[PDB]
Amino acid sequence: MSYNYVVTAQKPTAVNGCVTGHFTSAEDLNLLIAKNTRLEIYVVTAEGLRPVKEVGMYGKIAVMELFRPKGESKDLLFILTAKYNACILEYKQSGESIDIITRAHGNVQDRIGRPSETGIIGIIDPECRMIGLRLYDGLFKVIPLDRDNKELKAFNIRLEELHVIDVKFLYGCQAPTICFVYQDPQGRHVKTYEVSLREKEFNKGPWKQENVEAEASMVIAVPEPFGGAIIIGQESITYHNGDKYLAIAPPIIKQSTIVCHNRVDPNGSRYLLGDMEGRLFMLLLEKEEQMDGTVTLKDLRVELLGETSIAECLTYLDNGVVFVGSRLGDSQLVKLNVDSNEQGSYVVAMETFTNLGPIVDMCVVDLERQGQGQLVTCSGAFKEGSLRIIRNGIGIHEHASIDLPGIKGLWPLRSDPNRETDDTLVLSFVGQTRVLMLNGEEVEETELMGFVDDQQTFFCGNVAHQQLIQITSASVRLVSQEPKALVSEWKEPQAKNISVASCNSSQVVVAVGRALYYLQIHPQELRQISHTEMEHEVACLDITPGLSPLCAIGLWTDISARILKLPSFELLHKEMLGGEIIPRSILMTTFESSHYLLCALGDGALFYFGLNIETGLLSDRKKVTLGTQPTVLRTFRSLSTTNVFACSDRPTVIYSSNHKLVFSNVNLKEVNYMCPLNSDGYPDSLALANNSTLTIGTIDEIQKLHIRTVPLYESPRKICYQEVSQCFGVLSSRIEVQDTSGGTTALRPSASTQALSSSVSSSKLFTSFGEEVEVHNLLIIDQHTFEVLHAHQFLQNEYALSLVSCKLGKDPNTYFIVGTAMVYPEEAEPKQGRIVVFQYSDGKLQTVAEKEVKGAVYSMVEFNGKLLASINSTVRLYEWTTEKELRTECNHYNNIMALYLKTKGDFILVGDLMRSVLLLAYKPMEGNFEEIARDFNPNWMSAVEILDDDNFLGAENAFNLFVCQKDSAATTDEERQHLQEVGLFHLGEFVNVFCHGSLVMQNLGETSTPTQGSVLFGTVNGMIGLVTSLSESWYNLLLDMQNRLNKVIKSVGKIEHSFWRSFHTERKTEPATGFIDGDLIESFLDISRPKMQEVVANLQYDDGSGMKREATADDLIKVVEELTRIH
Amino acid sequence: KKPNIINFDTSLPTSHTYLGADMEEFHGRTLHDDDSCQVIPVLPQVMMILIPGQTLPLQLFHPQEVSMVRNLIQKDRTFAVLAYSNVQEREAQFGTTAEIYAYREEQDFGIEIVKVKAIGRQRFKVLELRTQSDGIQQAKVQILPECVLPSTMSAVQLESLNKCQIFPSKPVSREDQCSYKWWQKYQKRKFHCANLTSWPRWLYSLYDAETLMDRIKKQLREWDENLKDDSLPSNPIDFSYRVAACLPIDDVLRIQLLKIGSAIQRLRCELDIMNKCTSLCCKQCQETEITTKNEIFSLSLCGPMAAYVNPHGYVHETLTVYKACNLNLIGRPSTEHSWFPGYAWTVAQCKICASHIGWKFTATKKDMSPQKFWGLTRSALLPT
Ligand SMILES: N#Cc1ccc(N2CCN(Cc3ccc(COc4cccc5c4CN([C@H]4CCC(=O)NC4=O)C5=O)cc3)CC2)c(F)c1
Ligand SMILES: [Zn+2]
C-alpha cells in the first residue's frame, strides 16, 4: 500500500575504477571509466578526452578489466558486479550504431561462505588463460577462458592461508602463477602458487615464502623482462624474484601510505604511485644490469612529482598526461612535464571533471528565482571539501557583450546578396534605430540607406521579392535589395502613428489606432491588399504561416483574443483571454508539429491555446505563470524546429518534446528583449538584450543540470540556510598537526583561516608530536558572492554534530543552533556536550545561549517552535524562554541512541544505526511523549525520512531502500504497535541525507500531478535521487508495463532486472515490492516503434470508465512524458 | 584479595569430576535447520535460563525422566530447556536446546538414577506447549536464527583502501602503551571512511565488535586476572554468550539478553549492565551487602559463574568471591560431594534472614588459596 516511484535526477559522479586499452578498435586508445552503475567509454586524443559511449549496467562495477585472448582483434571487457554477476562484453559498432554485445554472462556466487574482509579481488592471467576471483575466505574461484565457456562455469580451490591481503598474477611464467601476501600470527608473508587448470588445484610456487615488512600492503607485478613482484608497504618498497631481492627505505613516502598504482611503460621501467593525502610518486626501476642477455634490477629510486587530488585510481594516458580518478574529490587530467619545475612540482593541471560525491548534507533553497528550488550540497572531504550549488535550467553560453542603454527591440536585416547569412542588425533605441552593422565583430553604427534614422521603428526585416521592409512609427518604408535604395514608401492614408505592426515574409499588417490595414509585398511596389476596421484598439497583432490563413489580434479595450481572416474582415474565431489586463504579445507557432497559439498577457501569464491551421480554432485552454512581466515571445531558429523564447523577468524557453511543451528556465537574471542573430562570426547564436547591456551567445540543447563550485579546502559536515540573514551556516573541520610547542599548526590555507572576521569559543562550564587533531568551525557564507563572511572556532576536543537554523518560541530573531560533544581519546562514549545558540547580525556572530548537556547531541530539530534534541539515547524537548535561555520541558528515555530525528506535525521518528526504527507522538494536552509503533530488525541503517503521516522511507544495509507503514485502522493492539514493512528496493547507492523539495517549477496545474510529494536523497557516489508516491491503479499499470519492458529491452550482461532490484543482504534476499524503477519506465521512450508496439498489447490503459484494451502506443507516451516532468 | 598464587589447575571444575569419572561421552555435535519448526521433548524440574555454550550438569531419579533420556539418546540427543520468566508454572516464551555429550545410568539404591551433562546449542521461541500424558511434554519450537552483521564500513567502504583493512596482530599481549596507542591508530585506520558518511569515527567505534569486545575484556581483567586468550573466543557470538553466562545478573536481564538476536546489541547491553552493576544483595532481604563488583574471580574456565548439581539433583549457578560480607557458617567443613577438587565446603547463611546464599570453601592442602573462596549461588542474589 505504498506504491512509490524512484528516479535518478543526477547520475553518480564518483569514480571507482578506470582502465585504458584498445576496446573500441585495435588502433584507437580508449579510457573506460566506471562510476558505479555507469560505464563510460572515452577516446584519448591529443586535445583531451572525447566521450564515445555511456552504458548503464544492472549492477555496481566491483571489478573491471580489459583482456585480449588469442585470436582477437581488440580487447574484451570483463566486469564483475557486487552481486557477483560476472560478464564478458565486446564493443561492436557498424557505422553509426553503437552496441555492446555480451560475450558471456553468469552468476559466480557460492551458496555458503563469508565474503572476504579485504573485499573482492579480480585478476586475469597475462596470457589470458584464466580469471581468478577471491570472493570468499579460504576459497579461490577460477573461471577458465574458452570460447565454449559461454556460461562462465567456475571451480573453487582451497586456500590454506585464510587472510590474503593482495594477490596478483606474475608475468613470465610457463604456468599460471599467482603471488600474494598473507597474514599469520607469526607476521606477514609472501607466497606463490602455480595454478593448474587440468587437475584443478594449486602446486608449489616458483620461489618459496619470504618474510616481508610488517605492513606489506600492495603487490604489483613487474612485467617482462624483469619479472617478479614488487611489494609496497608503509616504510619500504621491495622487489622479489626468487634469488633476486632488494629493498629501499625512502623518507619521502613515510608521511602517508601508497594506496594506488598504474604502470606507465610497456616494459615496466617506471611506475606511478599515489597516497592517501594525494601526491604523485614515481617509482623508478633501473635496467643497468646485463650480464649475458638477462635484465635485472639495480635500484628503485623514488621521486615525488607533485600534489594532485586525492586519487583512488591512477591511469597514465599517452604523452605525459595522467587521468587522476578521484572519488572523494574531483577527477583531474594533469600533465607530467619534466621541464617546467615551477616551484618543485612536476605536475600542472589541464582539466577537472565535476564530482558531487560524497554528499554529506544538502539543502533546498530558492536562491535566485522564486518558485524554483536549488540544491546546495556539502561535497568532498579533506582538502577537496567544497559547496556544490546545483540548479535546473538551460544554460546560455555567452560569446560576446556590448553596451546599449535599454534597447527596445532588436531585428536582423539583410542588405547583401543572397547567401543565407546575417550581416547587419538594427537595434531600436528609445527614439531612434541605431543599425549596429557588424560583418565580423564590429560595434559601430551604420544607418541603412533605405531606413529612417530617428523614428522608433516597430519592425525591420527582409521581405520577399528581394527587398527589406522597415516599418516605423510614422509610416512603413521599403528598400530595394540590390539597388539598396528606398524604392517604395507605403505612407499611411491618415498619416498617423503605427501603434502595432506585424510583418511576414510577403505580407504586412499595420495597425493605426483602432483600425487595421493589410498590404501585400510586391516586387518594387507596395500594393495594398485590404482595409478594415475594429471596434476596439488592436493591442497585439501577429501573422505567421507565403500567405497567412488567419491573423491573431488582441483587443486593447476588450482584453480578448480573436482570430480573423486576413484576406477578409469577418473574424474566424474569438475568446475571452481572462480579461484581467490587455494582452502583451500573441504568436502562432508549430513547435509540436501542430497549430499552437501562445498569447502572453502583460501580467506574466501565458494563456496558451490550441488553434487549427485549416479553419477555425480549438480551445485546449491552458494558463501558465511565465513570470511577472509582459514577455516578448520570439521564436529562435537555433533549435530543433522553431522553439520560442518568452523574454520576461523570468526567461523561459518553450520547447515541445513529446507533444507536451516543456518550459525550462534560463541562467539569466532578466532579459528585456531577445532575437536570433545568426551572424557569420557567431553562427546559430542569439542576441539577448537586458536592461543594461546586450549580449550574444548560444543556448544549450534542453534542460541541463548546472553545478557551481565553491571550494573551502576543508571538510564540510552540515549545511543550513537562513532566509532573513541571506547566509549559509556550514559546519566544517580541518586537520591540524600537533607540534612540539603546545599549539596546533594548520596544514594549508582553509576557508576558516581566510574569513573576513574570525572568532574562537571561550566557555568555562567544565599530545604526541605529529598527531592529527580535528579543529571544528562554523562558517557563515554569503548567499550571493559565496565568500566566507565569518568563521567561529569551537573549543579544543569539541566535535560539532548537528545544525539547525530556525526561530524558537515568540522571538522574532532566527538563530543558529549547534549541538556539540566533548570527545577525548581516553573515553569511548562522550559524557558531556553543549547546545550553543548563535545569532548572525551586522556581520558579527554572537553567542546568544549556551547549555551544558551530559552526553552527545546526535541530532536536533524544530518541533513547533520548540527545540527537540537527542542527547545520547534520550529525546528531550527544550522551550525558548523569554530571557533567551533554553529550558527543559519533557524527556523520553529510549534504549537506542537517537541518531536520526524527523518530525511531521506531531509525529517524531527516532532512528539509530541498528535499523531500530521507533515512532513517537507528542500529546500537547498532556505534554509528554508516547510511543505509537516500533519496528526492530538487526541491520545497518544510513538514513530515514517521513514520506507522510502513514509511510516512512529508510536506507538499509547493502544499498537498499525500505518503506514501512503503520496500520492505524487495525483493531488489535499488537498490530497497531508494529510497523508493517511494505516496500523493498535495491538502489545500489549509500544514501546519506533525505530532504523534501524539488528542482522543478512548482505549478498547481489545477489537475495536479500523478505523483504526490517529492523527496530527494544524496549518496556517497554523488547521485541525486527522487522518490514520489503513486496511486493504486497507476502503480498497477506501471508495474505491468515494467514487466513487459523486461522482455523487450536487452540489458548489457543479460542481468535480470528483478534480480538486480531484489532487496539484497548478506543474510537474506527478497524480490522488490512497492517500488517502481523510474529508470526502466523512462527507458521506454528510447526504443524504436516496433519495440514500443511489442511492449503494449493488452495493458487496459483507460481507467476513467472503459478499458480500451488496444491501449494505443502514444498513450504510454503521454504517461511517461508526464512522469518525466517531475525531475 | 589474593594475587599471584592462584594455583588450582582451573580446568577440573569444567569437567565435573564430582558427577562420576568413567562417564560415557558422545562423538560430536548436531545441526538444526534455521527457521524450521521442530518437536523437542522438555525435561521438567529445571528452572533456569541456560545461555548457549553453558554446561549443565543433571541428575535424574524419576522413572519417567530416565525413560525419556534413554529413548531420547537412541533417537537424536537433543532436549529443550525453557527460559521461564518471573512467573512460574510454564510461563515461558523463549528457550534453548541442550545437547547431550556425557551420559551414565547407574543402578545403586535399587533405582535407575542417570547422570548426564549437556551444553546449550541453539535458541528458540516456543509456539505451543502441548503436554503429553506420559509426563514428558514435547514443545512445538521454532528455531530462532542467529544474526551476524558485516562491518559498518562495508557499505561506505573505499575500494582503494581495502588492502589496509587487515590490521597486524596486537603487540605482545595485555601490555600498557601497546594497546592505547595501538587502539587509537586502529580506530583511525579502520573508520577512515566515516568522513564519507555524516557521523564521526567514535560513533562507528561504538558499534564495532572488536572495540566492545576489547572494552569488556579490559573491565573483566580489571575484575580478575584473565590469562589473555583464556578460552575467550574471537567470535563475537561466542564471546557475547560467554560474557552473558558469566555476568552476575538476575533472570529478567538474562531473558532480555537472550531475546537479542545480534552480537553487537548483546555486547552493548552487556557493557551497559556491567557498567551499571556494582553490588549484589540478598533477595530475601534486599537490605544486606554480601559482595561487590571487584571482589570477583574465576577458578573455572567458564568464568566467575557456572552450573553445578547437589546430590539431590537441584541445579545451582555459583559465583566465586575472594571475601563475602554479612555471612555466617554452620557445620564442620565437609568434602563428600565438592565440585572443587581439593576444598571442603561449609554452608553459608545470611546473618539476618538465614537464607542459603551459598557456601564457604575452606582449603585442605597448604599450597592453595587458604580458606578464601565464597561460592554463593543465585537463589538469593540480586543486583542493586
Ligand atoms: N527419587 C529419589 C532419590 C534417590 C536417591 C537419592 N539419594 C539420597 C542419598 N544421597 C547421598 C548423599 C546425601 C547427602 C550428602 C550430603 O551432601 C549434600 C546434601 C544436601 C545438599 C548438598 C550436599 C552437598 N552440596 C554441595 C555443596 C557444595 C559443593 O561443592 N558440592 C555439593 O554437592 C549440596 O548442596 C551426600 C550424599 C544420594 C541421592 C535421592 F536424594 C533421591
Ligand atoms: Zn538475607
Side-chain angles (χ1 to χ4, degrees), chain A residues 277-280 304-309 332 334 345-348 383 748:
Chain A
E277 182 256 340
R279 65 174 65 91
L280 279 171
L304 158 69
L305 291 203
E307 183 178 1
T308 56
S309 306
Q332 291 207 316
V334 297
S345 179
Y346 277 61
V347 65
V348 297
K383 66 189 188 83
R748 78 189 42 81

Side-chain angles (χ1 to χ4, degrees), chain A residues 907-941 943-967 969-1030:
Chain A
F907 275 104
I908 295 172
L909 181 64
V910 176
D912 63 358
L913 197 56
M914 291 275 88
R915 190 249 179 270
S916 309
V917 166
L918 188 153
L919 199 156
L920 287 182
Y922 176 67
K923 309 168 306 303
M925 320 305 128
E926 183 178 1
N928 286 39
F929 289 138
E930 57 88 19
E931 190 205 89
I932 301 299
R934 176 206 301 285
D935 189 358
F936 284 10
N937 201 1
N939 213 6
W940 300 111
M941 175 190 252
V944 73
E945 178 67 64
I946 295 194
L947 274 180
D948 57 355
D949 281 312
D950 214 13
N951 305 50
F952 315 95
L953 182 66
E956 206 174 4
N957 198 25
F959 323 111
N960 298 300
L961 283 170
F962 71 93
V963 166
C964 287
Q965 65 182 357
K966 52 142 172 162
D967 191 47
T971 182
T972 60
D973 184 79
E974 70 274 16
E975 281 315 339
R976 264 195 310 287
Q977 203 84 20
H978 188 275
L979 297 151
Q980 301 307 130
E981 198 199 350
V982 60
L984 298 162
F985 198 64
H986 183 77
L987 180 58
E989 311 265 350
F990 186 83
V991 162
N992 280 317
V993 57
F994 280 107
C995 76
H996 284 270
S998 180
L999 270 70
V1000 297
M1001 274 180 28
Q1002 293 144 0
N1003 189 5
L1004 297 153
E1006 181 173 9
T1007 67
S1008 174
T1009 67
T1011 69
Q1012 297 78 240
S1014 188
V1015 161
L1016 281 83
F1017 47 83
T1019 76
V1020 159
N1021 297 277
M1023 181 225 78
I1024 308 284
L1026 192 139
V1027 62
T1028 61
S1029 310
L1030 297 171

Side-chain angles (χ1 to χ4, degrees), chain B residues 281-282 285 287-288 290 326 349-350 352-355 357 380:
Chain B
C281 177
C282 181
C285 284
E287 65 183 0
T288 52
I290 302 97
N326 184 347
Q349 293 294 300
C350 189
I352 301 299
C353 70
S355 66
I357 297 169

